[PDB]
Paper text:
The third structure corresponds to wild-type protein (coenzyme-free) in complex with the substrate analogue UDP-6N3-GlcNAc. The substrate-analogue UDP-6N3-GlcNAc is clearly visible in the electron density map. The electron density of the azide moiety is weaker than that in other sections of the substrate analogue, probably because of radiation damage at this functional group. Although the sugar ring of the substrate analogue protrudes into the coenzyme domain (where the active site is located), it occupies a non-catalytic conformation compared with that of other representative SDR enzymes. The conformation of UDP-6N3-GlcNAc bound to CapE is similar to that of the inhibitor UDP-D-GalNAc bound to the homologous enzyme FlaA1. In particular, the UDP moiety of the substrate analogue establishes numerous H-bond and electrostatic interactions with polar residues of the protein. Unexpectedly, the coenzyme moiety is not observed in the structure of CapE in complex with substrate analogue. The latch is not observed in the two crystal structures of CapE with coenzyme bound because of dynamic disorder. In contrast, the latch is clearly observed in the structure with substrate analogue bound (see below). The analysis with DYNDOM indicates that the substrate-binding domain rotates 11° and moves a few angstroms towards the coenzyme-binding domain upon exit of the coenzyme and binding of substrate analogue. The latch is a flexible element that increases the contact surface area of adjacent monomers of CapE in the presence of the substrate analogue UDP-6N3-GlcNAc.
Author numbering:
A (entry chain B), D (entry chain B), E (entry chain B): -8 to 337
B (entry chain A), C (entry chain A): -8 to 338
């Protein structure tokens, strides 16, 4: 549900703004809230085409289409007036595009976020949920470094704005299974083309999250996050070599593997909580919550006083979570209707 | 050597601009270049008071004092006209203050650097060297993250602007030994006051670099870096417990150790080259050079083509260099005039 | 012909920048210039995903993919360095979305164009061709008004900057046949689904232009426009009722027609040249050239001196060109591969 | 009067801001409100001279002189604090000056307006009345195109701001008779110089409005416009050939006519309501009101659903209004004290 | 005390912001308020070092350290939220640095001040006290001219903002005795080096103010200034030749004097109140208060109506105040612990 258990919450008079609202996450979130009594869902983005396709597709009076840009504070102000909740998903998110145009990454992902937070604070928005990526933890590419910096920026407001004025929090998850351009559809197309599957490093591990998992994470933060939190879903992982086997077997395919080597900007394993975060997080069940530290702007935690619990802690990553067997991966894959439709047609 | 063996530069008609000029780094680089034939060293910062002290202290006709702020392009442009070389050291560099004010860290360390680079390109500057830190590699704190992003910003120029137009490169090094506020003067003060030494985690390792090491790394980049390069100096490391022991012994002191635990914003070990950087780097001897990849803006190294050499590389860090022994740390500590003076003053 | 008969251009050392590069117009111009000796075609937009699809689809070394936004001058300047030719197609071009967000239409279509022009002048670009629409002539909707104002902005340069510095011109054409979201694919879908064809006003006339027509108009301007020129392609028109009949017949289909009435934001007939433009234009054959007036900034053509030729001119519009017959419309519709494929797939 | 009939309106505690307040319309509006109990009339403009001449001329404690620029939002904010009503008349309004410097036209007429609207909304201004021109309908020159765009910008706020917060509307009229530089004083001076009257196109028609007519239009909008309205005064027209005859006869002059031809940037006839506007306007008597459409940002009126009433409608212009005879034009001319003083001295 | 006599004032829930808070005045003001029940003292400046030294030095939970820049309105907004009082001391204040970089002087001293005032007005700050210098009266160098302009800017808000919203006032004093770089420590070091004292012009007069005097002036304005006031402390002066004698005698030193001549950018005498200010000030005892004129923006005081009291008035400067004898100067010097410690060690 969209409401905590035993909660006195009604959406009848509320307005949700989604930035990046035409992207595929913005889109699944929109569908989740359309099934609610929310008054208005504002879809905010520069893409007049995407907006018109959605408008015609859903034909739903809850949906409002705003043209604007997170880089421009006046364009954000216009869509922010009267809004109660913001799911901030606008971002430059491709690794190579950010690597070659990092100033562009900073204007959208960092300054764009700060525009949206300042405007939500000015308009008395109740909640802002910022989206981030496991590429933000111990980051190595311009994309993940811009998102790690975006986290620092949204966290820093909790050392400055009253939760009862505007609650600001964020969610961090890995690439979603079967998202466009990702390795599941790459492999599947290779299978169907009778071409070899190109594996970078078969011993790489990545967390496995469906789109539905990633939408539930955003809804969990929307319901339970306190201001300054970063919220992560616990998730299993697999090696890429095993994901490939799994897809081979499901499609009963005989395609060879071709090892192409690790690409620029990629880790062997992804981290979801650094050592410090893991040391300080609270376990909410299927989620970890990382509370903002030093909300009173006391510096001494950084300088004079330390914690032997940080000294003793480990980081949370795709090598030390539950690494799925080949049969577990097939099972998880069969929960994805994307995989199922492709499996049928084959 | 401000110049490669077998080279001559006239610096005689050249102009060096140092941002961050009044800080202790700009200051040691400044002093290095005063002993050259350089025509003019422009000290650029907003600290009018420190500028006046440096002016009075050195009393040297080569030095010019410019007021201005890397956050303001017109302020930089005023100081950049006719400059040949820029050492870009302006930064917000404390961890806690970047953590709490990260928009200010982006404004000075990222947007400020881009202002300096765009103006240096506009004014036909020959080289810009950007200073960075080992806290930028696999960064955890807002400060190291902002410096990581600055590195991506200065490297991205080498895939747009042409080396014989403006060579743009950077150096990355760890905390300098005996710097203002760092653990060596902390520990020495604790000794002298007869108080216990507050150790966070005795098994932490940190690269050991003197100020003169760091100044040599900048000069090595100035002479030898190509556009897009990140230059690092190979360095030994020590554990924090052995650094305490070494000082305790040099000072013949018996203060207790008190373990206060790991502070927020800090790692067990520092990384100087990530796995991908190590795999791609060139060994210059006592230095590694990380060349910029994909100078022609081709995306296929990121998407379709990979490299097995990245796959079986690992990272260069303060646990896998040479970790000094207690007696090696004392030998290094004794090379520092700060340590000698403290020790002398101690009887 | 990317070059006038009796000319040679080496494009071999030349660089073309397309703003709006990922849209369907930039895409067809791009494909046109891939078959030339052009050194590099830079696709400029903020759509990182569409850029990656184009990159993978074409796999052509001439293509470079730049992230950036016509609203940001430094973003444009990065992509404009060393460019020889700019096709400026970036725009907000839907009517309802410019109507409801007209400040966004001004930011992208007017201020965005001025950013592109100032940077092209700064970087010594040889030509910029700006794309415009017949909704800009006697405009009624925020979209056509913003494009009318963009035309005034690019024409006003020719009364300031010098042709052998940067030639600046534009093309104006109507909706392209079978474009995304346009009435032809609407009607074909309605046929295939066995639903009635929703006609607004059957007596509306619109100029008929294919995508290849439109691409030829841009190439005609690139070869032949002078600075300040607005170029238009002469074109026939049809009424909307005959376009429906033509499709109904090609598809041997019997769907009813439903009249829904004129929508907000639309005219009965489109204008391609106003009265003043017609009076002043040169006939190039299948094209009209509208020269920029008063290149020396003299005001007297506006105040003290008039022209009897403007007085007895009229306007070039979709009612006074050649209005195609049903059978002529079917002949034109059959030249489009989109229509052929739809028709083929239909049995 | 300044107050609707039967209305409970008092100006005792209200503040009016006029931008472009030193221009000749700003000036007649000022004189109209000086005859009221308004507390303060702020005259806002860059022209320190014009302001000091007015200050000395009127010597009236209601008048306050602010220096500022509609292009600068901070300069507008300073004059906007505590204001109840704004008559926004600042503009670049010469045809050739806008044609040659259209970026200048956009910064004053379009962005300048958006600065004034955002600031009036921030300061809780009750009413903003924007002035526009018949050159804005089916516009052909940079000046009228910038004003047509300005209309779209002020209308668009009614799809976003509550009338009870800030009512935003606009008025559209043609050139005013006997305004400086206009054809009535040009002709009259030709008469007095014994030179031929230079007529562009004798068959051109233009609406005839006195300055007093144009001030009554602004007051009518101030009293009755709802948010998003464009308000036009019904007005007769004349051919230029007939205006010239009329002036010739009134002055009993024998001057020849010289035909100089249509100039750049001029239409044969002016439009006051386009076809779409005319189809949707309400007739208030001597005025038409064009209501803002789609205030709920429903797109479908643009895309899926049409109106056969638009299909059937005609536009409202100076050829299809009442075209005055030569005797009617003389009569109207004799109501203008400008014409009378010139007639006497002659 | 920090509270007027008989005043109902409590600092328990109040927040003070100090810009330029790491400079030596910002620092003495901070120490004064630390001795009070104020809830928070925010130290605002770009100098992360200075801030950390203070934090460690005082180790006091009242102190909060903000990084920011008066030149950036968003950086000021962050530190201004929830603030009750601002002591605005950020400035470029060296004569030669402003002379050579006057654009820099204008961005910090003039535009920086206007950022801080606009933000204090937006955040409903109760009081802003701006600091200025006697070099601002009849100014001759870029530094004093930028500060004279800063005074005009803060005064001008009182012709526009209600005191009950935000009271804006300023204090004007000369260089403080024994401040860093000033002539007392220069001379003293000359004495101790056995070098000649370099005197510019022995007949120059300057007002003598201790740091404690200058802090009491700021506290007096904080307690009693009304909006638009400039507040000056009455102060005696000395000739430089006499200051030098005094120091010579106190240290029983035989150093010669060397006359170096007047330097660029220096007056013979400093003015604290111009003629106009002196004519209009109220004498509060040990302070003069200069009230803002024409708070209703009536121009006529400038143009049509004059005051024979201005015609008759004199200016208040270091030649017409009480010029101290050599023995008086020694006495005043001995109240400065700086002088005392130096005297001892010698
Ligand atoms: C374009 C690019 O270089 N990488 C975009 C992409 O992020 P990335 O982490 O590469 O995800 P993927 O699903 O491709 O690889 C997963 C695993 O399979 C491996 N992999 C991948 C491709 C391949 O051919 N073979 C292979 O083994 C690969 O090494 C890894 O171990 O998609 C992201 C998010 N997509 N969404 N939403 C964007 O942020 C990025 O810009
Ligand atoms: C303020 C702060 O949090 N750290 C500033 C500082 O970065 P940092 O890495 O802390 O260097 P240090 O010299 O303090 O620690 C070395 C080792 O001693 C250990 N350490 C440190 C302090 C102590 O009391 N005990 C202790 O064991 C400690 O855990 C570590 O393992 O110095 C940087 C460079 N400039 N200087 N100095 C600034 O960028 C930073 O803001
Ligand atoms: C969204 C919208 O309102 N109109 C977009 C569109 O501009 P437009 O002029 O509508 O072109 P079209 O191809 O729809 O109509 C042709 C004729 O068919 C008639 N028409 C149209 C639709 C219909 O259902 N019935 C009908 O008779 C119609 O009245 C007309 O007489 O296409 C433009 C260019 N890009 N495309 N496609 C975008 O700039 C616009 O935002
Ligand atoms: C400077 C310029 O080119 N035109 C300014 C002007 O707008 P415009 O519409 O020309 O009004 P006018 O009163 O001149 O012509 C009326 C009729 O008489 C005709 N006309 C005019 C001059 C002439 O010599 N002969 C003639 O027949 C003319 O063709 C037309 O049919 O004044 C406007 C508003 N003025 N006010 N307030 C400004 O917006 C413009 O910048
Ligand atoms: C750097 C510079 O040129 N002047 C800074 C300085 O302001 P200023 O008024 O010079 O004060 P000082 O204490 O030096 O002279 C007092 C008298 O002694 C005389 N004087 C001074 C020096 C000397 O060698 N001999 C001498 O006779 C001198 O002529 C004068 O009659 O300190 C100021 C504030 N400092 N604080 N806080 C800054 O605003 C300025 O930038
Ligand atoms: Na922040
Ligand atoms: Na708008």
């Amino acid at each position: 549900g969209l409401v905590p258990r035993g909660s006195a919450m009604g959406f009848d008079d509320k307005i949700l703004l989604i930035t990046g609202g035409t992207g595929s996450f913005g889109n699944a979130v929109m569908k989740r809230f359309l099934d609610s009594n929310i008054k208005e869902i504002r879809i905010f983005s520069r893409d007049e085409k995407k907006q018109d396709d959605i408008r015609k597709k859903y034909n739903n009076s809850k949906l409002k289409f705003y043209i604007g840009d997170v880089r421009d504070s006046q364009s954000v102000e216009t869509a922010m007036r009267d809004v109660d909740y913001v799911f901030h998903a606008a971002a430059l998110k491709q690794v190579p595009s950010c690597e070659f145009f990092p100033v562009e990454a900073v204007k959208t992902n960092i300054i764009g976020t700060e525009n949206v937070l300042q405007s939500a604070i000015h308009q008395n928005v109740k909640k802002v949920i910022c989206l981030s990526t496991d590429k933000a933890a111990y980051p190595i590419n311009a994309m993940g470094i811009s998102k790690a910096m975006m986290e620092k920026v949204f966290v820093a407001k909790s050392r400055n704005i009253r939760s009862e004025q505007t609650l600001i929090c964020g969610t961090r998850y890995g690439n979603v299974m079967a998202s466009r351009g990702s390795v599941i559809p790459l492999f599947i197309d290779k299978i169907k083309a009778g071409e070899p599957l190109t594996i970078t490093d078969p011993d790489m591990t990545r967390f496995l999250m469906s789109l539905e998992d990633a939408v539930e994470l955003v809804v969990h933060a929307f319901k339970h996050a306190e201001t300054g939190d970063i919220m992560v879903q616990k998730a299993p992982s697999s090696t890429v070599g095993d994901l490939a086997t799994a897809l081979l077997e499901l499609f009963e395919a005989d395609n060879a593997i071709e090892i192409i080597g690790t690409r620029h900007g990629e880790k062997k394993a992804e981290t979801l909580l650094t050592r410090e975060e893991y040391a300080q997080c609270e376990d909410m069940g299927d989620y970890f919550r990382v509370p903002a530290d030093s909300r009173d702007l006391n510096y001494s935690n950084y300088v004079e006083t330390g914690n032997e619990k940080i000294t003793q802690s480990y980081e949370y990553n795709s090598d030390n979570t539950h690494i799925l067997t080949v049969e577990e991966i097939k099972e998880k894959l069969l929960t994805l209707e994307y995989v199922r439709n492709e499996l049928n047609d084959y």
